[PDB]
Design a protein around this ligand. Sequence first.
Ligand SMILES: Nc1ncnc2c1ncn2[C@@H]1O[C@H](COP(=O)(O)OP(=O)(O)NP(=O)(O)O)[C@@H](O)[C@H]1O
Ligand SMILES: Nc1ncnc2c1ncn2[C@@H]1O[C@H](COP(=O)(O)OP(=O)(O)NP(=O)(O)O)[C@@H](O)[C@H]1O
Ligand SMILES: O=C(C[C@H]1NCCC[C@@H]1O)Cn1cnc2cc(Br)c(Cl)cc2c1=O
Ligand SMILES: O=C(C[C@H]1NCCC[C@@H]1O)Cn1cnc2cc(Br)c(Cl)cc2c1=O
Ligand SMILES: [Mg+2]
Ligand SMILES: [Mg+2]
Lengths: 486, 478
Amino acid sequence: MAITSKKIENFSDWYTQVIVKSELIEYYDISGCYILRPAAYYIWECVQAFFNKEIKKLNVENSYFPLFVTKNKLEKEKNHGFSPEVAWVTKYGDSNLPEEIAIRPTSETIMYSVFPKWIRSYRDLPLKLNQWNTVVRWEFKQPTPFIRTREFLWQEGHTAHKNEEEAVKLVFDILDLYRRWYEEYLAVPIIKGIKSEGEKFGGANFTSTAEAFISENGRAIQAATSHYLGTNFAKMFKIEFEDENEVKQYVHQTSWGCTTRSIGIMIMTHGDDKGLVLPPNVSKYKVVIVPIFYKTTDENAIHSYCKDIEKILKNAQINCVYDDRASYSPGYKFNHWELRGIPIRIEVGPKDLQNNSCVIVRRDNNEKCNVKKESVLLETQQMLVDIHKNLFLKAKKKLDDSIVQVTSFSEVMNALNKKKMVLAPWCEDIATEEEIKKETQRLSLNQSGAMKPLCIPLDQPPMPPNMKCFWSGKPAKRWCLFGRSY
Amino acid sequence: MAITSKKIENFSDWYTQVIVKSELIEYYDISGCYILRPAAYYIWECVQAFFNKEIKKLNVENSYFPLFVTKNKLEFSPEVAWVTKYGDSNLPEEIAIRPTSETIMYSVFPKWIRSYRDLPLKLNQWNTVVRWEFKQPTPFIRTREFLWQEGHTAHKNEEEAVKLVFDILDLYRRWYEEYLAVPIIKGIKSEGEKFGGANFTSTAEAFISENGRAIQAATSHYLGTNFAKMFKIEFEDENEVKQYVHQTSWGCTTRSIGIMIMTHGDDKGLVLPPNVSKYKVVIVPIFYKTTDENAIHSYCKDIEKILKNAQINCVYDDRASYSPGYKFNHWELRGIPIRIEVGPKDLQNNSCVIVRRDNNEKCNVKKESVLLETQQMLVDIHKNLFLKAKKKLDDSIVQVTSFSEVMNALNKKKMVLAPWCEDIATEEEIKKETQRLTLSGAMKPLCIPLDQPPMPPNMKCFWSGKPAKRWCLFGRSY
Ligand SMILES: Nc1ncnc2c1ncn2[C@@H]1O[C@H](COP(=O)(O)OP(=O)(O)NP(=O)(O)O)[C@@H](O)[C@H]1O
Ligand SMILES: Nc1ncnc2c1ncn2[C@@H]1O[C@H](COP(=O)(O)OP(=O)(O)NP(=O)(O)O)[C@@H](O)[C@H]1O
Ligand SMILES: O=C(C[C@H]1NCCC[C@@H]1O)Cn1cnc2cc(Br)c(Cl)cc2c1=O
Ligand SMILES: O=C(C[C@H]1NCCC[C@@H]1O)Cn1cnc2cc(Br)c(Cl)cc2c1=O
Ligand SMILES: [Mg+2]
Ligand SMILES: [Mg+2]
């Protein structure tokens, strides 16, 4: 088992190979659904634990609402173009249901229908809820393991506040928790930003977003969402509270979500030609121990040594595996565990046993270092930190190198052709969005190739005071990130 | 609000009132589906964190398998929900929502298991399933959708598998007893009540005194090679000989929450084992003057700090809209284990008043020691709840030798322990005759308990008169 396609040459097939052979997923006889094996789900558990800790600090309470929602309830607020993606239960056994029932594609209509019962006065606020659940969307866009799946795991938070300031504050708090969840657990850098009027969630006042970029195929991917919903849903669902004068006021809402797409983003960011590369924080085993016998008499000495090292790491709660299987060569094992993304390999040969040393090898850059057994615990600890740092830094470099700043449309296509995004001064007129889509599609016929507004970044470079929009020529308001996406 | 029906007098309405007014659930416009509000879901998270910790000591690895299973792979029948449409178009073939995941997982087990080095395979899922139940649903107890976990393992032999079966069963015991303060009885299902694909089903049974109802609390099966043969799950042993795997499966649902409520709830509302209550303590201030307000606020906050510094989550109810009485009632209703009242008189003593939820005992405590006496109290409450429940379980069993004795016992809201021949045949006979004489009156074999009383040398079966093999538990259920 080896990775047959190179990441830069054939990214799609490299991806499918990596995720199957590293034992993250199995494919399934229902298109767009994938089995999450222990190695994948472990990553989900880690980020889940982190995120739970941090939102409980914000006093968000977990909850669980039904998987099913009635047609009447799901469809109450007009359509507001999701309808072909709804999966419908039409019967139980061989008996038709009087009315069909939908599986949740998200929980707005389920939760907000009961919010008025729970919110009567200003004394009931804020209301802060989260769910860890599964949803179903029958994606017609190309399904891709983790990135776009028809059933996926995720978290949805919904809150309601007495005013705008408090809700918006929470929207950005959540957003930085997403930043930390990418950075600290997946070693993935993201760009924070505000979605254009064309790209935001229809029900939202504004949509803030974390964007990632896969440099290897030049594609941006939305990494997480955090919305200021204002009073839009409060009006739709009649969610009001009597204020301190017993005057009825609309709540100010937020919602926010992040999915197993994250695992996908992480795989694509750090994976190399040898396979999966895991940040230590989301790998079950931090270290693999591999014995080496240069045709040596005593297997048992080396075995006992290896065992000692394993006990040292395990006792320090650094989980590890000792691969003592007789039926595979050391080289086989090196490759096998590289493919599975074990952050550190420790090799023990006969020479090492004589010197009370061992050889430590980093998954990320393949650097080796002979070190004394009695120092392995401190070395390992530090190395697991270094690895994370390295991964993050490398990813950040690629991210920063993927942003070409431009001032006129004339520079754009070149940039797109080099698998980059563009940062451009933009008038933000809603009409220009589809225009820019159409033109970049058309011009891509020569080189979907359309580029779209990814986000208005929080980190704006200086805007020269007479600067014009790259596209319309009108006055430019802010810098916007554009690029091709998933 | 308060509880309008008494537990002993009208159990159903009491239960409905308690779950809604203590803010555990909201009813929903699809029958048998219930919203889990933060207080119920918190309970679920606690027992989940515990179970995860323990199965992870057994090298069980969590995973997630799809909600959907194809018609082919799936093939009880009318209980499955079918998705047949996306938007306005029909799926070319209908897909089911999982009622359980045996066919989803065991289909892929052959690919993952090649040799004894791949064994044991130990997987768990925290997920949801849907079963379209015929019976009227009961919040937590029997719901159309429920959360649960499913564990599935495959071992190289019978011995290892069976040992895992009972390790898991004990973990369920601890789930109920150390976290929900509910006593259970370990037993083995009769040959008609067991899981069909199983070699044997082990089970934990609970009982509700007040309505005389037995509830299956959790399951742990030895599956032997049944599924290994039907699904072709084989491993190369250490001599390169192919052998069938020996499998196990086990599960426990949000029903456990129900079992706890019913067990500990009283006529003031919810009663919670301290470890599954978000707030262990509510601190309530008591005023006379506007002058007192500051000194009592500070003091209160001080207590708060102490508790929270010792990782004891608590709520200071400094609301002015409400009287201390209303507060007491409100937080008792929501099942907070401890109430610390702080008044002026207490303030002059550097003391306060601590009040227990389970038995309403009050006592004065000096600020300096509040921490230590709260910790102890939280232990004591759990213990008291468990012990009391245990008594009520023990007094719920009536040992009989002939069917002559059964019926009075049943009608006293009891279950019977009887010597039985374990003839599958006798199982529906007994049920047809027990109800002849919104829930059924029939009684069924609950479990053949692991702790067997001695069987007198030639004792006859309480029903068929044939020789008795073992002592079995019989009773009414949901
Ligand atoms: N099918 C999917 N599988 C996995 N993750 C998804 C899927 N659809 C959306 N997400 C992610 O879920 C988060 C919440 O997304 P949401 O607001 O529901 O996205 P959306 O409106 O559907 N945008 P789109 O990706 O174009 O479908 C986003 O950060 C997406 O990255
Ligand atoms: N509808 C339900 N809601 C909640 N818990 C349930 C439900 N059905 C079964 N359980 C519990 O889930 C656990 C696993 O049992 P399982 O084998 O899945 O069902 P079961 O034994 O067939 N129960 P039943 O269908 O009522 O005869 C047991 O503790 C059951 O009591
Ligand atoms: O799901 C959303 C908005 C937000 N819901 C809570 C978590 C964070 C998330 O961004 C946008 N969205 C995305 N896909 C959908 C698909 C269908 Br089908 C429906 Cl009915 C509705 C939707 C839908 O509302
Ligand atoms: O669900 C089971 C057996 C075990 N599955 C894994 C966890 C523990 C549990 O006891 C029994 N069971 C109960 N109800 C079912 C309903 C339907 Br519909 C189907 Cl198809 C199958 C079943 C079914 O197999
Ligand atoms: Mg979408
Ligand atoms: Mg059933």
